[PDB]
Design an enzyme around this catalytic site. Structure first.
Site, PDB file in Angstrom:
ATOM      1  N   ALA A   1       0.787  -0.984  -0.082  1.00  0.00           N
ATOM      2  CA  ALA A   1      -0.233   0.081  -0.187  1.00  0.00           C
ATOM      3  C   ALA A   1       1.257   0.676   0.002  1.00  0.00           C
ATOM      4  CB  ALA A   1      -0.841  -0.467   1.401  1.00  0.00           C
TER       5      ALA A   1
ATOM      6  N   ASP B   1      10.920  -6.232  -2.363  1.00  0.00           N
ATOM      7  CA  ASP B   1       9.192  -6.664  -1.910  1.00  0.00           C
ATOM      8  C   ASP B   1       9.530  -8.123  -2.359  1.00  0.00           C
ATOM      9  OD1 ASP B   1       6.956  -7.102  -0.603  1.00  0.00           O
ATOM     10  OD2 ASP B   1       6.301  -5.826  -0.629  1.00  0.00           O
TER      11      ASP B   1
ATOM     12  N   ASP C   1       7.315 -10.201  -1.794  1.00  0.00           N
ATOM     13  CA  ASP C   1       5.729 -11.091  -1.275  1.00  0.00           C
ATOM     14  C   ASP C   1       5.155 -10.681  -3.287  1.00  0.00           C
ATOM     15  OD1 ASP C   1       3.296 -11.991  -0.323  1.00  0.00           O
ATOM     16  OD2 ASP C   1       2.370 -10.192  -0.057  1.00  0.00           O
TER      17      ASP C   1
ATOM     18  N   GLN D   1      -3.663  -0.894  -3.149  1.00  0.00           N
ATOM     19  CA  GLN D   1      -2.236  -0.860  -3.854  1.00  0.00           C
ATOM     20  C   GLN D   1      -2.755  -0.860  -5.276  1.00  0.00           C
ATOM     21  OE1 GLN D   1      -0.008  -4.338  -2.453  1.00  0.00           O
ATOM     22  NE2 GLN D   1      -1.250  -4.215  -0.608  1.00  0.00           N
TER      23      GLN D   1
ATOM     24  N   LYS E   1       4.719  -7.973  -6.937  1.00  0.00           N
ATOM     25  CA  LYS E   1       4.461  -6.846  -6.383  1.00  0.00           C
ATOM     26  C   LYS E   1       5.576  -5.900  -7.114  1.00  0.00           C
ATOM     27  CE  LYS E   1       1.824  -7.554  -2.085  1.00  0.00           C
ATOM     28  NZ  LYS E   1       1.727  -7.018  -0.673  1.00  0.00           N
TER      29      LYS E   1
ATOM     30  N   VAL F   1      14.361  -8.196   3.069  1.00  0.00           N
ATOM     31  CA  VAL F   1      15.105  -7.683   3.473  1.00  0.00           C
ATOM     32  C   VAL F   1      15.327  -8.329   5.186  1.00  0.00           C
ATOM     33  CG1 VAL F   1      15.918  -5.264   4.955  1.00  0.00           C
ATOM     34  CG2 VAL F   1      15.562  -5.015   2.245  1.00  0.00           C
TER      35      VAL F   1
ATOM     36  N   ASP G   1       4.943  -3.375   7.039  1.00  0.00           N
ATOM     37  CA  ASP G   1       4.021  -3.751   7.492  1.00  0.00           C
ATOM     38  C   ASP G   1       4.138  -4.800   9.016  1.00  0.00           C
ATOM     39  OD1 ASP G   1       4.607  -6.177   6.431  1.00  0.00           O
ATOM     40  OD2 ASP G   1       2.881  -6.795   5.828  1.00  0.00           O
TER      41      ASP G   1
ATOM     42  N   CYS H   1      -4.366 -19.989  31.597  1.00  0.00           N
ATOM     43  CA  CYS H   1      -5.505 -20.757  32.390  1.00  0.00           C
ATOM     44  C   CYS H   1      -6.677 -19.577  31.447  1.00  0.00           C
ATOM     45  CB  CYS H   1      -5.717 -20.325  33.710  1.00  0.00           C
ATOM     46  SG  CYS H   1      -4.346 -21.559  34.911  1.00  0.00           S
TER      47      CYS H   1
ATOM     48  N   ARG I   1      -7.240 -21.550  28.544  1.00  0.00           N
ATOM     49  CA  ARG I   1      -7.747 -23.090  28.396  1.00  0.00           C
ATOM     50  C   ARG I   1      -8.964 -23.538  29.400  1.00  0.00           C
ATOM     51  NH1 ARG I   1      -3.660 -23.589  32.399  1.00  0.00           N
ATOM     52  NH2 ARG I   1      -2.321 -24.446  30.768  1.00  0.00           N
TER      53      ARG I   1
ATOM     54  N   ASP J   1      -2.577 -18.779  36.326  1.00  0.00           N
ATOM     55  CA  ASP J   1      -1.358 -18.932  35.779  1.00  0.00           C
ATOM     56  C   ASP J   1      -0.525 -18.546  35.936  1.00  0.00           C
TER      57      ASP J   1
HETATM   58  N1  LIG Z   1       1.040  -2.281   4.465  1.00  0.00           N
HETATM   59  S1  LIG Z   1       0.729  -3.399   3.409  1.00  0.00           S
HETATM   60  O1  LIG Z   1       0.075  -3.085   2.163  1.00  0.00           O
HETATM   61  O2  LIG Z   1       0.503  -5.018   3.845  1.00  0.00           O
HETATM   62  O3  LIG Z   1       2.190  -3.373   2.308  1.00  0.00           O
HETATM   63  C1  LIG Z   1       3.657  -4.351   2.961  1.00  0.00           C
HETATM   64  C2  LIG Z   1       4.885  -4.806   2.265  1.00  0.00           C
HETATM   65  C3  LIG Z   1       6.158  -4.490   3.532  1.00  0.00           C
HETATM   66  C4  LIG Z   1       6.243  -6.203   2.503  1.00  0.00           C
HETATM   67  N2  LIG Z   1       7.794  -6.968   3.453  1.00  0.00           N
HETATM   68  C5  LIG Z   1       8.247  -6.951   3.321  1.00  0.00           C
HETATM   69  C6  LIG Z   1       8.915  -6.327   2.152  1.00  0.00           C
HETATM   70  C7  LIG Z   1      10.865  -6.007   2.218  1.00  0.00           C
HETATM   71  N3  LIG Z   1      11.530  -6.454   3.063  1.00  0.00           N
HETATM   72  C8  LIG Z   1      10.615  -7.577   4.452  1.00  0.00           C
HETATM   73  C9  LIG Z   1      10.925  -8.000   5.187  1.00  0.00           C
HETATM   74  C10 LIG Z   1      10.073  -8.196   5.516  1.00  0.00           C
HETATM   75  C11 LIG Z   1      10.027  -8.588   7.080  1.00  0.00           C
HETATM   76  C12 LIG Z   1       9.296  -8.738   7.747  1.00  0.00           C
HETATM   77  C13 LIG Z   1       8.853 -10.014   9.752  1.00  0.00           C
HETATM   78  C14 LIG Z   1      10.088 -10.534   9.852  1.00  0.00           C
HETATM   79  C15 LIG Z   1      11.366  -9.945   9.093  1.00  0.00           C
HETATM   80  S2  LIG Z   1      12.797  -9.793   9.405  1.00  0.00           S
HETATM   81  C16 LIG Z   1      13.533  -8.804  10.415  1.00  0.00           C
HETATM   82  F1  LIG Z   1      12.668  -8.793  11.068  1.00  0.00           F
HETATM   83  F2  LIG Z   1      14.372  -7.280   9.783  1.00  0.00           F
HETATM   84  F3  LIG Z   1      14.941  -9.172  11.589  1.00  0.00           F
HETATM   85  C17 LIG Z   1      11.578  -9.277   7.559  1.00  0.00           C
HETATM   86  N4  LIG Z   1       8.982  -7.559   5.294  1.00  0.00           N
HETATM   87  N5  LIG Z   1       9.252  -7.063   4.146  1.00  0.00           N
HETATM   88  C18 LIG Z   1       4.893  -6.822   2.443  1.00  0.00           C
HETATM   89  O4  LIG Z   1       5.646  -8.279   1.761  1.00  0.00           O
HETATM   90  C19 LIG Z   1       3.742  -5.671   1.787  1.00  0.00           C
HETATM   91  O5  LIG Z   1       3.931  -5.806   0.162  1.00  0.00           O
END
Ligand SMILES: *NS(=O)(=O)OC[C@H]1C[C@@H](Nc2ccnc3cc(-c4cccc(SC(F)(F)F)c4)nn23)[C@H](O)[C@@H]1O
Lengths: 972, 76
Positions: free
Chosen positions: A431, A457, A459, A469, A481, A507, A531, A587, A590, A752
């Site tokens: 987004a 990205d 994803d 988006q 993306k 990343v 996100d 608890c 559970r 707990d």
């Molecule tokens: N807000 S949204 O419309 O949902 O769009 C958000 C984007 C952000 C993309 N994520 C993304 C892109 C590039 N690099 C990374 C790395 C991570 C990530 C997430 C959790 C843990 C970790 S390991 C750490 F924390 F870095 F040590 C990395 N997410 N990334 C989404 O794909 C979406 O398109």
């Protein structure tokens, strides 16, 4: 309402609001950048129809912010060209062109009319009057360089059904006294405010108090409120749940004409509240100037026209004395900048108002959220570069016959060229990323010979993404993306061809080989579009390490924020904490649920165990010799086994009996409904459950079995696939259901054997198919199971059941999201980005932003300066400084270096989770350690790609005392 | 004197304060009323974020002033 498209937005607006928007016809007048931006956000959101009116021909200068215009469109009508591209955003939304607005009476077809910057003040007044007097909602907005405004008039009687969109407050009651003093159970906060309304349930002894009657709240501390006398209702005995109710509010708006003389303001920035009244006259003066100069705005950077505008404002303050009030002068310098910038068309500003105005449209259609009442003015004058660096005059801000001319109009040619020559990294292509890339396309950022854009990205594009988006289309589903977004913005601005490197890498610590020292060092700055909090922390730590500016932002429904992180100047993102996610006691999960959240989390864990963990544990047991308490029992159950779908039905029916009948009877055996501690055991958070008697006509009972069976069939490769009650009855009716027998020797927490398993020899080739949780596929039975399973337990404990949409929200951990907030916060980011381009070192020029469009609320704050520290009277930056050490140094030398150069005795040395040295270590450990290079020292306690190692240290100063000191970077 | 704190959710909190009170002390009062630990509070007023070790008067916070309790959001 198509849940598969509107999922994330539905969690922001709710079904009732979106149903109302789907009956609403919207007209937008003007399709320069502002109008197209509002139109994009409104079409994405989903109204009944969108009509656009703009018969003006496309000129090159229109492309400054109008991302749906191309150079080939020049000469053609703005409306006609834009219509087709708008239509593509949402197939559910018809997009029409109005060819002429000769008859003001045509406006009668529309629920909401938006007048943008193509409409004269004279015409706005006439249109507003028609709208106001006819019951048509009117909104206007205009942007002029780094300035902008919006006006909202929703007529004489407008009903707000929900002022905030926040979840209604609920809570458990332990007492209601006869004066109406309500006491909360234990340490539960009610969270209510004076003047809120609540209704009651389960209040024993006061019967009619529970009928849905509303009570006004008088707050007496965080654990008590008063509702007024309850003597007449009865006498309080026990129990009770309050639920907050949002009452409707009728509000009255004044017409534009009345509001021109006596405006009512919402402020964009409280630091600038004085400017609102000044700009109100300014914007009116601009229209008067255009009237006097045959439709022309003041000339760019022209001192003569500025003096005329100042005189126009001075004259207007006399005609409109209530605007500035007695004794307040015309702010001549402010009015001068408005005149100077009048012709400007700035992406960040267009995006800010595009998002905001589009939200106001949605409010006007639905009665959801509190409307802006009635004027808002904004400026981002801090975005201007230092005139010493980039002078602004009639020569430098002149048109060069270019799509960027109306940006050059504000910033000058050289600043524009510097924007082009920026090297930037964008983390995320969702987004925020899409809105960012569009903004960057419009800026020509990274299009110059020294510049570029890197966007990454990992994803792929999914259907629910398309609602917010906007660079993606239904055809793009399944594609990456970043790659799709890169291509879309090159089509918007060809200057970016060959200048965007769309990567698909995630990343994190595991891709440091790709995103290495060289990659980060080349960059001018980094922009987050993430996100996840950990992802943001990771990037922030990299920007700290490499001393790079970071632009941060985020949204949650109508809420948003921006943060700027500047090397050697500000604190970073990780320097401050946000509220952690609240943890539910084990608890409570559970044995003692009292909210649907508890039954959903329990159902999701059950889903995991049954269909993922079980399958994985079997597969590991059958392939791994090494494999060998809860795990063992699951393996035996899994392997002692369905041969058809009917067996899966039987299994799920028996699971039903186990979870919602037998286990409940066991709990009630341990703690009978009548049991006591003085007080009853089953009170407050503990709700006395009742065992379920399976009734296939109960939708939750039926779907537990359907989904449980279908999922078990998936585990064992049995063909599955609406479900028919009688078909399932023809299996279940013939079953013998084992009776409950109580286990006397089972302890239940209030606050707990092994060779039974079959030989893997006898089951060669056998494998279970584990389920991978997929919340966004409504055919896979996943949400169906979690909803039904949760609801049966909700039935056990007399918790109100939830539908599939709510269950998916909680179990799926879905972040509410809408295009309006996304485009607005991205606009704000791009107004800060200008300051990075000018290398501003004055912290007071930067603005962290905070928004909630529901209210609407806009607020800004100067970033926090990086905390400074000292050791041995040497000052350092606690965020930005570090000890750089060249070469794979020996421990003793490192200790020697710190004593000699820094006057620090190293008391502790660590690498990650590994302790490497301490001053309390004994001679034998020290001997095996002191003479080793850091890599060898790390090797002794535990890679070729690695060029640096980060070390943490505690140290004592010259006077012996412990002192906070920065980290060490070993350069290998 | 009375001041107001507005949260990003629309909730108004009323505080009794003196001009010379520290930001740390205002945050403690917010914690009592709302439960938010001082380290998680971000208060903004007239273009500034309020920092520990300074006083209300340092930020020209007057009687009937409104502070904004704001948040950072995770979505994107
Ligand atoms: N807000 S949204 O419309 O949902 O769009 C958000 C984007 C952000 C993309 N994520 C993304 C892109 C590039 N690099 C990374 C790395 C991570 C990530 C997430 C959790 C843990 C970790 S390991 C750490 F924390 F870095 F040590 C990395 N997410 N990334 C989404 O794909 C979406 O398109």
């Amino acid at each position: 309402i198509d849940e598969s498209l509107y999922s994330r937005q539905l969690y922001v607006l709710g079904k009732e609001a979106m149903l109302k928007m789907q009956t609403s016809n919207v007209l937008i007048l003007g399709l320069k950048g502002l109008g197209v931006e509002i139109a994009k956000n409104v079409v994405l959101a989903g109204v009944k129809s969108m009509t656009v009116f703009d018969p003006e021909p496309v000129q090159l200068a229109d492309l400054s912010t109008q991302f749906f215009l191309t150079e080939k469109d020049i000469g053609q009508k703005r409306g006609d060209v834009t219509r087709a591209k708008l239509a593509e955003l949402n197939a559910y939304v018809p997009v029409n062109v109005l060819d002429s607005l000769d008859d003001v009476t045509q406006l009668s077809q529309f629920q909401v009319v938006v007048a943008t910057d193509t409409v004269s003040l004279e015409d706005k007044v006439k249109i507003n009057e028609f709208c106001h007097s006819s019951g048509i909602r009117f909104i206007s907005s205009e942007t002029r360089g780094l300035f902008g405004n919006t006006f909202v008039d929703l007529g004489d009687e407008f009903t707000v059904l929900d002022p905030t969109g926040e979840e209604p407050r609920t809570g458990m009651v332990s007492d209601i006294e006869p004066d109406g003093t309500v006491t909360m159970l234990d340490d539960n906060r009610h969270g209510l405010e004076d003047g809120n309304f609540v209704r009651f349930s389960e209040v024993e002894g006061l019967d009619k108090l529970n009928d849905g009657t509303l009570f006004k709240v008088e707050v007496l501390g965080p654990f008590a409120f008063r509702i007024g006398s309850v003597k007449e209702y009865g006498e309080y005995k026990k129990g009770g749940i309050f639920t907050e109710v949002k009452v409707p509010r009728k509000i009255s708006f004044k017409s534009l004409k009345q509001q021109l003389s006596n405006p009512e303001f919402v402020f964009s920035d409280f630091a600038k509240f004085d400017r609102a009244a000044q700009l109100h006259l300014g914007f009116q003066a601009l229209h008067q100037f255009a009237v006097r100069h045959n439709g022309e705005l003041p000339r760019t950077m022209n001192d003569e026209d500025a003096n005329e505008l100042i005189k126009l404002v001075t004259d207007l303050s006399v005609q409109q004395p209530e605007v500035l009030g007695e004794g307040v002068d015309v702010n001549e310098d402010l009015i001068k900048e408005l005149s100077y910038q009048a012709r400007g068309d700035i992406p960040g500003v267009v995006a800010f108002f595009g998002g905001l105005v589009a939200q106001e449209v949605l409010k006007a259609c639905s009665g959801k959220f509190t409307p802006l009442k009635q004027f808002m003015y904004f400026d981002s004058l801090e975005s201007l570069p230092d005139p010493k660096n980039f002078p602004r005059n009639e020569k430098t801000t002149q048109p060069v016959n270019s799509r960027y001319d109306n940006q050059i109009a504000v910033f000058g040619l050289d600043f524009q060229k510097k924007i082009a020559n920026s090297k930037v990294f964008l983390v995320g292509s969702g987004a925020i990323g899409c809105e960012m890339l569009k903004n960057w396309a419009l800026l020509g950022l990274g299009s110059g010979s020294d510049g570029y854009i890197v966007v990454t990205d990992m994803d792929s594009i999914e259907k629910s993404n398309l609602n917010r988006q906007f660079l993606f289309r239904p055809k793009d589903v399944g594609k990456n993306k970043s790659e799709v977004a890169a291509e879309a913005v090159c089509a918007m601005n060809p200057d970016l061809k060959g200048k965007i490197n769309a990567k698909i890498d995630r990343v994190g610590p595991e891709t440091e080989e790709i995103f290495n020292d060289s990659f980060w060092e080349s960059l001018d700055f980094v922009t987050n579009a993430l996100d996840n909090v950990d992802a943001r922390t990771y990037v922030d730590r990299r920007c700290v390490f490499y001393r790079k500016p970071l632009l941060e932002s985020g949204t949650l429904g109508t809420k948003g924020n921006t943060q700027v992180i500047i090397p050697r100047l500000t604190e970073s993102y990780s320097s401050s904490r946000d509220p952690p996610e609240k943890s539910i006691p084990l608890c409570t999960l559970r044995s003692f649920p009292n909210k649907i959240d508890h039954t959903i989390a329990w159902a999701k864990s059950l889903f995991q165990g049954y269909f993922t963990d079980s399958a994985e544990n079997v597969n590991m047991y059958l392939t791994q010799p090494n494999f060998v308490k809860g795990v063992l029992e699951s393996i035996s159950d899994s392997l002692s086994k369905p041969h058809n779908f009917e067996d899966c039905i039987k299994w799920a029916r028996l699971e039903f009996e186990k979870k919602f009948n037998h286990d409940i009877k066991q709990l009630l055996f341990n703690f009978p409904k009548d049991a006591k501690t003085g007080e009853p055991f089953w009170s407050g958070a503990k709700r006395a459950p009742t065992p379920l008697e399976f009734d296939i006509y109960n939708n939750d009972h039926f779907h537990f079995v359907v989904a449980g069976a279908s999922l078990r069939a998936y585990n064992y490769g049995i063909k599955s696939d609406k479900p028919n009650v009688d078909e399932y009855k023809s299996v279940i009716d013939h079953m013998i259901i084992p009776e409950f027998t109580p286990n006397a020797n089972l302890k239940i927490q209030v606050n707990d054997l092994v060779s039974s398993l079959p030989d893997p020899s006898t089951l060669a080739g056998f494998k279970l198919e584990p389920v991978d949780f997929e919340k966004d596929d409504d055919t896979n039975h996943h949400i169906e199971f979690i909803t039904a399973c949760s609801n049966c337990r909700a039935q056990n404990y007399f918790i109100e059941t939830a539908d599939r949409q709510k269950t998916k929200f909680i179990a799926g951990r879905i972040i509410p999201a809408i295009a309006t907030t996304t485009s607005l916060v991205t606009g704000l980011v791009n107004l800060e980005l200008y300051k990075l381009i000018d290398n501003k070192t004055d912290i007071e020029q930067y603005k962290n932003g905070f928004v909630n469009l529901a209210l609407p609320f806009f607020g800004f704050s100067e970033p926090i300066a990086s905390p400074k520290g000292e050791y041995n009277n040497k000052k350092y930056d606690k965020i930005w400084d570090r000890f750089d050490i060249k070469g794979d140094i020996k421990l003793s030398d490192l200790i020697e270096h710190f004593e000699k150069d820094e006057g620090l005795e190293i008391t502790m040395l660590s690498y990650g989770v590994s302790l490497l040295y301490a001053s309390f270590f004994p001679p034998k450990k020290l001997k095996e350690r002191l003479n080793l290079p850091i890599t060898q020292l790390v090797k002794l306690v535990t890679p070729a790609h690695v060029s640096t190692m980060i070390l943490e240290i505690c140290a004592d100063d010259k006077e012996g005392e412990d002192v906070e000191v920065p980290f060490i970077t070993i350069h290998l | 004197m009375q001041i107001f704190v507005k949260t990003l959710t629309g909730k108004t909190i009323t505080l009794e304060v003196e001009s010379s009170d520290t930001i740390d002390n205002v945050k403690s009062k917010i914690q009592d009323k709302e439960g938010i630990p001082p380290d998680q509070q971000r208060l903004i007023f007239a273009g500034k974020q309020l920092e520990d070790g300074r006083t209300l008067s340092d930020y020209n916070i007057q009687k009937e002033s409104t502070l904004h309790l704001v948040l950072r959001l995770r979505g994107g």
